[PDB]
Amino acid sequence: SVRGANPLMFRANVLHMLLEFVLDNLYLNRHTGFSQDHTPFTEGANLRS
Amino acid sequence: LLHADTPRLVTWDAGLCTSFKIVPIVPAQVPQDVLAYTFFTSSYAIQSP
Amino acid sequence: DCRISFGMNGAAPMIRDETGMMVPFEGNWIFPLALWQMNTRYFNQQFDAWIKTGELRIRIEMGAYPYMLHYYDPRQYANAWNLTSAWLEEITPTSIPS
Amino acid sequence: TLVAQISETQYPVDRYLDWIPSLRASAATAATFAEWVNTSMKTAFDLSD
Numbered sequence: 504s505v506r507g508a509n510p511l512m513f514r515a516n517v518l519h520m521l522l523e524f525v526l527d528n529l530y531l532n533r534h535t536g537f538s539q540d541h542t543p544f545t546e547g548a549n550l551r552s
Numbered sequence: 553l554l555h556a557d558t559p560r561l562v563t564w565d566a567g568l569c570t571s572f573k574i575v576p577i578v579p580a581q582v583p584q585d586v587l588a589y590t591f592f593t594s595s596y597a598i599q600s601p
Numbered sequence: 602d603c604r605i606s607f608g609m610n611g612a613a614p615m616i617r618d619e620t621g622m623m624v625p626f627e628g629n630w631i632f633p634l635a636l637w638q639m640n641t642r643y644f645n646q647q648f649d650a651w652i653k654t655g656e657l658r659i660r661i662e663m664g665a666y667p668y669m670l671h672y673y674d675p676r677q678y679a680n681a682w683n684l685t686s687a688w689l690e691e692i693t694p695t696s697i698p699s
Numbered sequence: 700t701l702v703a704q705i706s707e708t709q710y711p712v713d714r715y716l717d718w719i720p721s722l723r724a725s726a727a728t729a730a731t732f733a734e735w736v737n738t739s740m741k742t743a744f745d746l747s748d
Binding site (some may be wrong): 538539547549 | 722723724725727728
């Protein structure tokens, strides 16, 4: 069945999912740029583009 | 053993870093008898987080 | 923090004060320019029917502003609503009309 | 003298124009203001270089 799954493989499936999650979220945040706000919503903030 | 493929260690990311997204499920009842349609910000198309 | 709440079943709609009170659309008010600047469309839709007809005095603290004035004829009828609603509709988050 | 009026520095100025609303100027805003001042000065004094 396409809609079915074996209940006894759940731990291995979850561990593989966590491995995929960690092994994907393995990047370095990069500085991009900023721009001073002109509108009065933020009180002179440095918005990021 | 002569020439092993090098891995990729540094991989920059430019977008905002997150993994949880908020998703709507059912449409809202913006046109309703009780409250006038001028109350909701959806009528004025104000973008919300 | 100024939040507008509609009144159900005929109760007057009322906005939120600085202390936390909910005051109705009456009396004399004081607004910073930034409030109307950020809510140029919500406030305009809700306040026109009260400023023109009902009792509502709003003082918008600005500091300095460019002005342009029109000389009307005093021996004839005059009305400045068509002149004021234009400014209150062209008020925008980025800029200010004269 | 004219950038210490709108920015936040420690240059002792008279600060006459404080009743006129403004914002805490940032680097880009101050740079644009300085460029306008510079081009106005060159235009007035007839310089090209």
